[PDB]
Design a protein around this ligand. Structure first.
Ligand SMILES: [Mn+2]
Ligand SMILES: [Mn+2]
Ligand SMILES: [Mn+2]
Ligand SMILES: [Mn+2]
Ligand SMILES: [Mn+2]
Ligand SMILES: [Mn+2]
Ligand SMILES: [Zn+2]
Ligand SMILES: [Zn+2]
Ligand SMILES: [Zn+2]
Lengths: 313, 313, 313
């Protein structure tokens, strides 16, 4: 049995639309924990991370809420590192994707050999010197990369940070809205990725075969899955901050996660950018939440083909 | 020319939502028969099967309307067996999927070597001892299997029944909502299937190549296609009793059926679970009916690439 | 750099629903030209082709508005031939697909070795003697084919015409609504095509590999892409004259065009059948226009994976 540890993170200072704050909330009332237990899972919810307010948090150049983002992540990392040390998989129900910084950081403290699968319509690899918005939920990857150890200036609240992954340890799946500076970083650091073009060309089947062998070619190792809800198409996950048409299918979302589970190597999972306050209708919110939950359960065993426990039925 | 024989079956006692009753009706007024004739088809409609009411039909353990379901099927089988003996393909326009019991039963009486392709989001293989709802439209396959000759008790109205197919003679396509007991039966009886996971992995192209070679590997034989409208995604066939998201695409539905036609071996076709009374809007009903009809015509020659009769145009 | 030349063509006499007239208009106010320039493109808009009215244009047998269609095309050809001679790619923002006659005709005058990719739900290959509607937007291909040099009578306004392509120089992608006479012409002239059946079987990835090697097997040559908006599914391009469900996906539409751009051989592009007056809602119009624009930019470099100019970021 692969055991889980819920980590609610109602943070939103990584982007403008604050609705993401109460995202861990809408997921739990959906019955996520219950459904996980409803499965062969052993679940322990560590509660929502109370991120005290940091009123005095002016901009740093163009970067917004740097101390608030850096604090919420430095805290989360400490928690992530706690559950992983308690023999469990970290399930971070988030607000915005800036939390990844702390989530992957903590996971690494325990399993430094980890590999990352980043499902997003975006690469979130902009730097304070490349960002054009200042919103830190589109810059987390730039802080975790060792290669970028030089082009990222010191941001208030990110002193505690120390790049924990190489360019050859992360795979992107779903990309379809990448900046020019971001693309440049990809080709340069030789980052592995499967944009929607490659998904259309290859099929989600081969794309998963290739990403997993890429990550587990030489050796098996803890897998961290960072799932940004906007990776999927808006017709499935409409209630999110920055939607891009031409996204991953419901089925493709499930394939992604069913295959990861079958690897038996999932140790870290992030479920970010779900914002109910942006759904134009009550059903759009429900649609988004149900999809999020569904992708979650697939990571932990729920397969569309069927489930049966070892007992003579 | 492969000739057809319409068999309307306005039955619904296989499940609670009775709207399925008047399903053969909404299909005919759509012009199905007409459109079939509008093709290279030779069509003969044997009329709707009048299933007299059986007021005194209390439950048998948990199983509901057992005598009503058993009667409607024992009758249909007698009809199916009639058209097939009259050199035609049986087209059963149904209500609920419990009718399959009689439809496949009758077809076998004529062609005992038949093979079955079961397109459904469900396996409908629960037994009276495993069913958790008691609705017989989710138990028909359990009654047709020879291997299960032992774990199915005697149900009032199903005495006439005698299992007519082995586990290696049926292929499922579309599965995405299977019970634990049902999954167990699959793995145990080694039943061939392509759930949505495999469809996503392989593609509907290879899935059809593999199911057909599986069924026709050793020898060619009469093919019975049991098509449950919920096999397709609810965005295409919304007006159905038990919808499951992440279903088969419109195109995939057509591919399935175009390939079956091209085999030249189609002898039995079921079109079930269409319930106009469940469509939330007039257009949802139309959408579902048009899709049903479309899948029907593809089984009998209508190809998206084009059609041309042997004449110098 | 591959340079572009905008050619607005507000023509509609190729079909009944005149809304297509003001199609080049809705595309420009969308910012198409701007966005093209916003890219690495060198754009020059030759303005909209003013197609004077030809009041006295009675039917020719069954063919409607023959002099109006023939005139608007003979003019466009003269323009197309002009930009191509001015070292640019022809971008024809159209109304109805009958304009292809003149668009491909002019392009050929400059590059007679050109190859055509025809993205449509239809083949538009009916002849005045086969057409059953008389609308010339469903007959343009029949006028450009050298093999059909015999079965097409003289239509008022098409004297200037001289078939400029062989059956082995055109590839169709997207077909799903073909007449019997049209299918006959395909099989007979041995025309290469990938209907939705083949797309479902092979995947848009292989379909593009096969069409490009088919067209560029022996030698590289100028590529003309005739994109009829109805080639895509109505859920993406609803505001069009003759919509057919089961069409090409948004993603597939982009794959088509991204691969064509990567060939570096695009010389001619048509964007037809966009009719805002048929969108049932303001958003349906927007959805259709944005999709059209998006397919356009992909033809000229915009890739979902990312873009970066040769400069040390
Ligand atoms: Mn994103
Ligand atoms: Mn993100
Ligand atoms: Mn079903
Ligand atoms: Mn069923
Ligand atoms: Mn068309
Ligand atoms: Mn067309
Ligand atoms: Zn952002
Ligand atoms: Zn049921
Ligand atoms: Zn037309």
């Amino acid at each position: 049995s692969r055991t889980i540890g819920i980590i609610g993170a109602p943070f939103s200072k990584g982007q403008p639309r604050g609705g993401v704050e109460e995202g861990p909330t809408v997921l739990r009332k959906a019955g996520l924990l219950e459904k996980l237990k409803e499965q062969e899972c052993d679940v322990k919810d560590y509660g929502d991370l109370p991120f005290a307010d940091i009123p005095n948090d002016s901009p740093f150049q163009i970067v917004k809420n740097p101390r608030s983002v850096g604090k919420a992540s430095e805290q989360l990392a400490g928690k992530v590192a706690e559950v992983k040390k308690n023999g469990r998989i970290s399930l971070v129900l988030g607000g915005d994707h800036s939390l990844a910084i702390g989530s992957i950081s903590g996971h690494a403290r325990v399993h430094p050999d980890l590999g990352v699968i980043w499902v997003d319509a975006h690469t979130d690899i902009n730097t304070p010197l490349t960002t054009t918005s200042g919103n830190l939920h589109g810059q987390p990857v730039s802080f975790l990369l060792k290669e970028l150890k030089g082009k990222i200036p010191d941001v208030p609240g990110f002193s505690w940070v120390t790049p924990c992954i190489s360019a050859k340890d992360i795979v992107y799946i779903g990309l379809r809205d990448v900046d020019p500076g971001e693309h440049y970083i990809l080709k340069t650091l030789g980052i592995k990725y499967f944009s929607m073009t490659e998904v259309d060309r290859l099929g989600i089947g081969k794309v998963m075969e290739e990403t997993l062998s890429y990550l587990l070619g030489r050796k098996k190792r803890p897998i961290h899955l960072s799932f940004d809800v906007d990776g999927l198409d808006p017709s499935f996950t409409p209630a999110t901050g920055t939607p891009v048409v031409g996204g991953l299918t419901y089925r493709e979302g499930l394939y992604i996660t069913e295959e990861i589970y079958k690897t038996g190597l999932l140790s870290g999972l992030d479920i970010m950018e779900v914002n109910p306050s942006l759904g134009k209708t009550p059903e759009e919110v429900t649609r988004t939440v149900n999809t999020a939950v569904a992708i979650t359960l697939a990571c932990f065993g729920l397969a569309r083909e069927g489930n049966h426990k070892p007992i003579d039925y």
